[PDB]
Design a protein around this ligand. Structure first.
Ligand SMILES: CCCC[C@@H](CNNC[C@H](CCCC)C(=O)N[C@@H](CCCCN)C(=O)Nc1ccccc1)C(=O)N[C@@H](CCCCN)C(=O)Nc1ccccc1
Ligand SMILES: CCCC[C@H](CN(O)C=O)C(=O)O
Ligand SMILES: [Co+2]
Length: 154
């Protein structure tokens, strides 16, 4: 199961992974399993109730950072596994420059674009307690407000 807004776990700052061992491997496999089951394109650890800096998608990014971006930004409609039935436009840089660690603890530097850039940014935010509604266009926010209220109500 995936945790839903407005659960407060989603609002915490996830903690850096320090042990790149067997627990980590198990946690990451669990994340993939849950992701495949939910037919998600990606998943962050907080969304399965683990407050650790881990993101996966269909590879693995541990303790990621985003450290630069294109001038070009665009709005794309996003959904989020933590917000059933909710969609809206989010403006983000087209291209981002990132760093992260792999399952063995080696550091990697990468530039992401297109779809990977988008997914990565959305998931990265989860690790910081930031949710896509926080960054949604004012118009789409309003359109989705009644539905957010209902999510809060249950
Ligand atoms: C209804 C207005 C659509 C406005 C469009 C704005 N610019 N879209 C450009 C993107 C290019 C991908 C960005 C890296 C595009 O061409 N999107 C296609 C779907 C691409 C599928 C990739 N597996 C799209 O929205 N096509 C479409 C077809 C028919 C009607 C409406 C839209 C947009 O935000 N599309 C959304 C999908 C909307 C789902 C339909 N209910 C989108 O591409 N979001 C998204 C992209 C990448 C990661 C996460 C989310
Ligand atoms: C725009 C990112 C989509 C990721 C979302 C899952 N999710 O909320 C990841 O954080 C999905 O697969 O639909
Ligand atoms: Co999400």
């Amino acid at each position: 199961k995936i945790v839903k807004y407005p659960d407060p776990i989603l609002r915490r700052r996830s903690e850096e992974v320090t042990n790149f061992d067997d627990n980590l491997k198990r946690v990451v496999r669990k994340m993939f399993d849950i992701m495949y089951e939910s037919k998600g394109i990606g998943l962050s650890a907080p969304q399965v109730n683990i407050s650790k800096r881990i993101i996966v998608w269909n590879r693995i990014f541990i303790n990621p950072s985003i450290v630069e971006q294109s001038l070009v930004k665009l709005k794309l409609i996003e959904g989020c596994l933590s917000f059933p039935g909710i969609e809206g436009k989010v403006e983000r840089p087209s291209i981002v420059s990132i760093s992260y660690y792999d399952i063995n603890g080696y550091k990697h530097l990468k530039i992401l674009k297109g779809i990977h850039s988008r997914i990565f940014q959305h998931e990265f935010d989860h690790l910081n307690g930031t949710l896509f509604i926080d960054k949604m266009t004012q118009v789409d926010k309003k359109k989705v407000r009644p539905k957010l209220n209902e999510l809060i109500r249950d």
